[model samples]
Target: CPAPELLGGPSVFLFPPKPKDTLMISRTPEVTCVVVDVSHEDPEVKFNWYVDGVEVHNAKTKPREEQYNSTYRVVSVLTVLHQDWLNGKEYKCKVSNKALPAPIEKTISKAKGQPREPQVYTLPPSRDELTKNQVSLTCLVKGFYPSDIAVEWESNGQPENNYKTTPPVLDSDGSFFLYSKLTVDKSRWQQGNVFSCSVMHEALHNHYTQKSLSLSPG
Candidate 1:
């Protein structure tokens, strides 16, 4: 009875982490440990959890047996309160089997996690589209983490309501990207009105990103 392979090792992430347009009051964070490719008669695999070097009393474990492969997969999860996670407490997961010499251990923390600021830019309508009665401005916010972001469009100094913002799209490097589009009448745009895109993220703290575009009399 050897220790199974830990799929991608242990990782800590928010449980319901999807970012939406509406506001939410809370997000629950969980630490997950996954082990796969275990034999049927492995003699009851064991899992242990620790937080900041102290063992946690209770954690949830789930196991599954693969029908075709004749193997098993085990998942262990530990839920953490928002306060502890925000305080950047460390979490650890240990896995072991009967015949294994040493237990496998993994640790994660908020301080060691990746947090990236978003890059914001505004694109004016193309020449072909500018020839029409209406034009569109595209604001792209890219390469951010956690997916908690706010994007807005402003005409002159007032907020513009007629805009569409996409849900956070995951990128290849585990970052997030978003797009906000604003449609306006060409007459207003040609009159040298200033249009701005504003972006807010937790990574930026109190500061935010803003990009403004306008067609002045040249």
Candidate 2:
């Protein structure tokens, strides 16, 4: 009766290690491609591509391409031909093979332009920490003619609505002054938060002068 207690007896147990996914980068001038290789031997696979988290369809592939020239291949490519691509957009590729246990994913970023130099005063502690409910931030720039200018504001590293004001009057010295202001909720100040004000003047070589400030409660 002692051995009969267990019907199946002590089951022989074996655990298989999980398979690791592999991703490869394939890049060309003005384009970045991600080649995904699935571990399974299945001939058919599903491919998906994403740009900045938005799903994108492959314009070159119609019904889908099989793994022929390469092993378990799934490819996604992004062309950087527009100004939107200069914002450091990210691309993701995902591959699913019928025989593979799980799908594989890869991510790549397009090269971005160098940050522009800001032309305004630096606010300490950044913009997010400032108490916008009670305080207002103002930016002023000088040395322009006719005062043709544009201003911008950034809150918490994100672009905010621009508060445009009447252009400043020009002086007899062939120069003008411009001023802009932004209101923010100051109670939410955080480290590294960016409050940036920028001005673009025609007299300034057609480039913008920007000033940034970090918000601090103390």
For model 1, residues 16-96, the per-residue Cα lDDT tens digits are: 222221122354456677776566667366777778989886788665646476656666768676556545677777777
Q: What are the models' TM-scores?
A: 0.54, 0.35
For candidate 2, write residues 102-177 as lDDT tens digits: 5545555532333323334543433464534534667766555434345566665676674455466654555655
Error of 2 at 136 (Å): 0.8
C-alpha root-mean-square deviation, each candidate = 7.7, 20.8
Cand. 2 Cα-lDDT = 0.46
Supply every candidate's count of residue pairs whose N, Cα or C atoms clash at under 3 angstroms.
0, 20
